[PDB]
Design an enzyme around this catalytic site. Structure first.
Site, PDB file in Angstrom:
ATOM      1  N   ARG A 197       0.822  -1.195   0.000  1.00 27.65           N
ATOM      2  CA  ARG A 197       0.000   0.000   0.000  1.00 27.65           C
ATOM      3  C   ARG A 197       0.867   1.260   0.000  1.00 27.65           C
ATOM      4  O   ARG A 197       0.485   2.281  -0.559  1.00 27.65           O
ATOM      5  CB  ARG A 197      -0.981  -0.023   1.178  1.00 27.65           C
ATOM      6  CG  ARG A 197      -2.093  -1.059   0.990  1.00 27.65           C
ATOM      7  CD  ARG A 197      -3.035  -1.137   2.179  1.00 27.65           C
ATOM      8  NE  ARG A 197      -3.860  -2.340   2.105  1.00 27.65           N
ATOM      9  CZ  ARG A 197      -4.539  -2.857   3.131  1.00 27.65           C
ATOM     10  NH1 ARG A 197      -4.494  -2.280   4.329  1.00 27.65           N
ATOM     11  NH2 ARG A 197      -5.259  -3.961   2.960  1.00 27.65           N
ATOM     12  N   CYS A 253     -13.807   5.212  10.457  1.00 27.69           N
ATOM     13  CA  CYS A 253     -14.948   5.016   9.568  1.00 27.69           C
ATOM     14  C   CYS A 253     -15.906   3.985  10.158  1.00 27.69           C
ATOM     15  O   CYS A 253     -16.377   3.083   9.481  1.00 27.69           O
ATOM     16  CB  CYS A 253     -14.505   4.636   8.148  1.00 27.69           C
ATOM     17  SG  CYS A 253     -13.548   3.112   8.027  1.00 27.69           S
TER      18      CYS A 253
END
Length: 440
Positions: free
Chosen positions: A136, A229
């Site tokens: 990532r 989130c």
């Protein structure tokens, strides 16, 4: 298809509000958005022209629009658009990084927030952007470059590994913490599969570990932005209470034009929780987020590379006829020339995927300017440019040469006002320097 345990939890937490909430979760639409780039020459104008002058503004960022991005067109390729879900934009906006600050994005991939921080910093100060997954981090590094960020160090570490290097260092730290992901239910159906009744508390403990490292890297009066989130109190209000109970930190206001939901005092154990921000899918715009801004009042413990002679010559030539002058320090690793912000500490012992602005590569008796440098150009009047058409853009991103009378050497290819990369005009044909790994 909500999980039964989740349905019960939030029936109790929300009361009658729970129905609208589940109804949003199961019937509602995933919101889509992107941002234009103030770092770019005519960033907004270029988006209005080649995307749309009709698109609707996003609720939670000055530079946001509702909609989707053509990942294979030129506004995206050249970094004029970054796709980011609408509620996620709240985090970068809350952070309000300032030009010249030392700023840390601790859990940074894919790069949605780092990218809004960098827009805020206008190439001044130092942005360190860390991602723990090497795969990532690569993605993150490629987005920073695309976005044209010249003052970033991209790091590949776990939070704790950074502490020895950055103890008491930062003005500002953004922690978008790994969390249970209940705000990802609509968007990622795997998120539902992976959710269990024990996820919130499991995530809570990890959040505390990440934050205990983060707080050590704050300057006196440095600011911490925490976000998630997920909807769980265990990961939101309880984390903020824990912070306030165990550290000399104050909960701070997050000025916004767009009205939003707030943290709930009854879900925490300290004052001021109403100053934290909640985004509910049944109530507000976007998928679901929690954000908090705090000030730290403690005082944390604070405890080759030069260019070859010929490389000096080579770079000076190029920088002269291309009229670019470096601001940070010039270092070479693997024949890669980098311009590193003066604010960078020593990076020895760090896994660094990206060290400031990649200027170019030395090769056989030559210096070659980089894609990064092309995409960080702000002043197009000052350098040798070769305007191109969209068809030529097509050929260029495919990796093909195209034809243009002249022999000017290294040239910045520019589409209308968009710098798309370097070409090298040699005897009437423009040779191709669009990175091989990006061609279509």
């Amino acid at each position: 298809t909500l999980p039964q345990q989740f349905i019960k939890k939030y029936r109790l937490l929300l009361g009658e509000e729970a129905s609208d909430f589940f109804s949003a979760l199961e019937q509602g639409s995933v919101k889509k958005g992107f941002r234009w780039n103030p770092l770019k020459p005519a960033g907004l104008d270029m988006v209005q022209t080649y995307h749309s002058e009709e698109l609707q503004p996003a609720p939670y960022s000055n530079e946001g629009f509702l909609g989707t991005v053509n990942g294979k067109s030129f506004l995206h390729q050249a970094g004029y658009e970054y796709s980011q879900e609408p509620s996620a934009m709240i985090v970068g906006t809350a952070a309000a990084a300032k030009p010249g600050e030392k700023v840390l994005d601790l859990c940074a991939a894919p790069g949605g927030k780092s990218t809004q921080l960098a827009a805020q910093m206008k190439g001044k100060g130092l942005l360190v952007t860390n991602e723990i997954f090497p795969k990532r981090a690569k993605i993150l590094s490629e987005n920073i470059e695309r976005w044209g960020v010249s003052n970033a160090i991209v790091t590949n570490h776990a939070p704790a590994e950074l502490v020895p290097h950055f103890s008491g260092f930062f003005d500002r730290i953004v922690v978008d913490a790994p969390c249970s992901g209940e705000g990802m239910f609509r968007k990622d159906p795997n998120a539902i599969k992976e959710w269990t009744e024990e996820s919130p508390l499991y995530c809570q403990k990890r959040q505390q570990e990440i934050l205990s490292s983060a707080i050590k890297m704050l300057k006196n009066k440095g600011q911490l932005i925490y976000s998630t989130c997920t909807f769980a109190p265990e990961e939101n209000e309880e984390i903020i209470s824990w912070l306030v109970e165990n550290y000399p930190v104050t909960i701070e206001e997050i000025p916004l034009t767009q009205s939003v939901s707030s943290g709930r005092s009854e879900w925490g154990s300290v004052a001021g929780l109403e100053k934290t921000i909640r985004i509910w899918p049944h109530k507000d715009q976007g998928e679901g987020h929690f954000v908090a801004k705090l000030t730290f009042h403690g005082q944390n413990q604070m405890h080759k590379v030069q260019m070859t002679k010929e490389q000096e010559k080579l770079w000076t030539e190029f920088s002269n006829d291309f009229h670019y002058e470096a601001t940070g320090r010039l270092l070479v690793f693997n024949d890669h020339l980098w311009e590193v912000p003066e604010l960078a500490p020593s990076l020895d012992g760090l896994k660094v995927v990206r060290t400031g602005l990649h200027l170019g590569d030395f090769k056989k008796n030559r210096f070659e300017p980089s894609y990064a440098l092309a995409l960080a150009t702000k002043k197009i009047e000052n350098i040798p440019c070769l305007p191109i058409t969209q068809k030529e853009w097509q050929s260029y991103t495919a990796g093909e040469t195209f034809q243009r009378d002249g022999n000017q050497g290294w040239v910045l290819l520019v589409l209308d006002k968009i710098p798309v990369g370097f070409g090298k005009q040699v005897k009437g044909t423009v040779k191709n320097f669009f990175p091989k790994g990006l061609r279509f």
